[PDB]
Amino acid sequence: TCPFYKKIPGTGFTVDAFQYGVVEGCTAYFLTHFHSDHYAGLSKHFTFPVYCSEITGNLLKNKLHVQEQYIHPLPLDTECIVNGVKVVLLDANHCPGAVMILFYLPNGTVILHTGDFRADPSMERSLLADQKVHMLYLDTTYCSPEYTFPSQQEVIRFAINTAFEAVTLNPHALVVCGTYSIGKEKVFLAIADVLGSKVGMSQEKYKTLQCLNIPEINSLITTDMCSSLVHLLPMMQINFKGLQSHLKKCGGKYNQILAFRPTGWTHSNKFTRIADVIPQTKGNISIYGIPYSEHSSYLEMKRFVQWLKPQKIIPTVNVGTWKSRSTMEKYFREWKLEAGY
Ligand code: NI
Known about the structure:
Elements: E1 7-8, E2 13-15, E3 28-30, H1 36-39, E4 50-53, H2 54-63, E5 71-74, E6 80-82, E7 85-91, E8 99-104, E9 110-113, E10 135-138, H3 152-169, E11 173-179, H4 185-195, E12 199-200, H5 203-210, E13 221-222, E14 230-234, H6 240-249, E15 256-263, E16 280-282, E17 285-291, H7 298-308, E18 312-315, H8 322-339
Parallel strand pairs: 2-3, 3-4, 4-5, 9-10, 10-18, 11-14, 11-15, 12-13, 12-14, 15-17
Antiparallel strand pairs: 1-2, 6-7, 7-8, 8-9, 16-17
The structure holds nickel (II) ion.
Nickel (II) ion (NI) binds near residues 33, 35, 94 and 116.
Family: Belongs to the DNA repair metallo-beta-lactamase (DRMBL) family.
Subcellular location: Nucleus
Protein name: DNA cross-link repair 1A protein
C-alpha cells in the first residue's frame, strides 16, 4: 500500500506512486523523473492522468508506450492549474527532465516536493524566493556529514584531462563509459568533445537519448560503433572480464581500454581529493570510479533547508530503519537551532 510520504494532503494527488495499483482517492499521479524506482508500474495500459515535464513525457510515450491522451506535460517555471489546484514545476538539478513540484493548497498551505535533487544556490532565485513553504518533502539520500563530494565541474575536468592524456599518448586506446539509466550524460559527452569523436552506443540507448531535448545531439552521439572511440556500455559490463570481451569485439582496432564508472558516493571520498583518484588496472585495462553525484551532498542539503526555513520536513529516502530516521531528525533539529527558525 502507498506510503504516507507519497501522498499530498488536501489534494487528490500522489507523487512517484505507480506501483500500488489504484490509489484510493487519487485523481492525478505526478512523476518527478524517469528513474525506475519512481516510474515502476507505468505502461501502455495505464489510463489515469500523469503529470510531468516535457522530457519525462517523451520518455513515457517512447520507452514505456504510455498513450498520449493520458500524458499531461507542463512547462517549467509556470503557474498551472491541475484539478483546481495551482502547481509549479521547477528544475531539480538531477537527471534530464527531473523536477521539484510546488503545490499551493486551497487552504493557504504551500508544499514543496523535491523529487530527487542536487541542491544548488541557483534555486534560491527561482519562484521559491517569492513565498513561504510550510511543508518540505525532502530527498535525504546523503543526509549525513560523511557525504562530501566535489562539484560536478571538478569531476568533469578530471575526466576530460585523464581521457585526453591517455588517448594522446596512445591513439589506439578506447574509452568506455558505463550507464544504466538516464543522468550523468555530461561525463561521456565531455570526453567525446575533447577527443573529437561521437559517442557510440546501442540502438536502445540512442533512442532514450533522442527523447531528451539536448541541443546538437545528432552531432555528439551515434549507433556506429566502428566510427567512435568513446563507447557506452551497461554499468554491469564495467569490470575486467566484461571489458576484455568488449576489446575482442573491436577486431584489433584498439589495444588498451580506459573505462569510467560514475558512481554517486564511495568512502574513498572521506580520505581522498579528486586530484588524487587512481584507477584499478589489470594488463591493458584501467577502471576509474569517479564521484559524479546527481544528489545533494550533506552541506548542499543543509544550506538549502536553512535558506527555505520550512515548518515541517518529511524525508523521502532512508525512511525504512529507525536508526536512519532518528539520525535524520536529529540533523533537522540542529539545522533549525543553528539558523533560528
Ligand atoms: Ni533518481
